[PDB]
Design a protein around this ligand. Structure first.
Ligand code: HEM
Length: 154
């Protein structure tokens, strides 16, 4: 798929807001993910033991990782589709070392879209949400093709 420049602008306009507080957005997103789809939490051996949302909130490690994850996503979105180099090391660790099914990357995409909608309603109307969704579908499609080249999905 190919996003137009107008779609990329909408995606990079709300991302610039996210970057004013990367650690807070990373927290919100991972928690949303773990509350919604608790099975995803089992993939994290470092966090697995967290029992409540108050425990998740207070985990410094969880917050640091959310910054790591968002920063990597942010560097991929700023490429505007030319992200093959960035995608390689990420598809290799998630498919071979962590073992994250595509289905889970759909669950976090939903969590990202939920959180941006809540925090940024003015910069995340229907057209901007459709453009972010398009950018994440692209990301998933490219990641899934890489998984297949690496021997993991399908
Ligand atoms: C927006 C998509 C995602 C991005 C950009 C992302 C990015 C990253 C980055 C940059 C790291 C550290 C370096 C490495 O291990 O590759 C990481 C580690 C990890 N990721 Fe992701 N990830 C994504 C989705 C997920 C999902 C959906 C799951 C699981 C349900 C997952 C599970 C993990 C685990 C288990 C680690 C290791 C955590 C620790 O260090 O122990 N990731 N991810």
């Amino acid at each position: 798929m190919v996003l137009s420049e107008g779609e990329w602008q909408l995606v990079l306009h709300v991302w610039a807001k996210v970057e004013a507080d990367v650690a807070g957005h990373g927290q919100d997103i991972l928690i949303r993910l773990f509350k919604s789809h608790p099975e995803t939490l089992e993939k994290f051996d470092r966090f697995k033991h967290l029992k409540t949302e108050a425990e998740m909130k207070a985990s410094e490690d969880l917050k640091k990782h959310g910054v790591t994850a968002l920063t990597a996503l942010g560097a991929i979105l700023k490429k505007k589709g030319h992200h093959e180099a960035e995608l390689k090391p990420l598809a290799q660790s998630h498919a071979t070392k962590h073992k994250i099914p595509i289905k889970y990357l759909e669950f976090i995409s939903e969590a990202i879209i939920h959180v941006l909608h809540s925090r940024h309603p003015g910069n995340f109307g229907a057209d901007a949400q459709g453009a972010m969704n398009k950018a994440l579908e692209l990301f998933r499609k490219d990641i899934a093709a890489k998984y297949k080249e690496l021997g993991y999905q399908g």
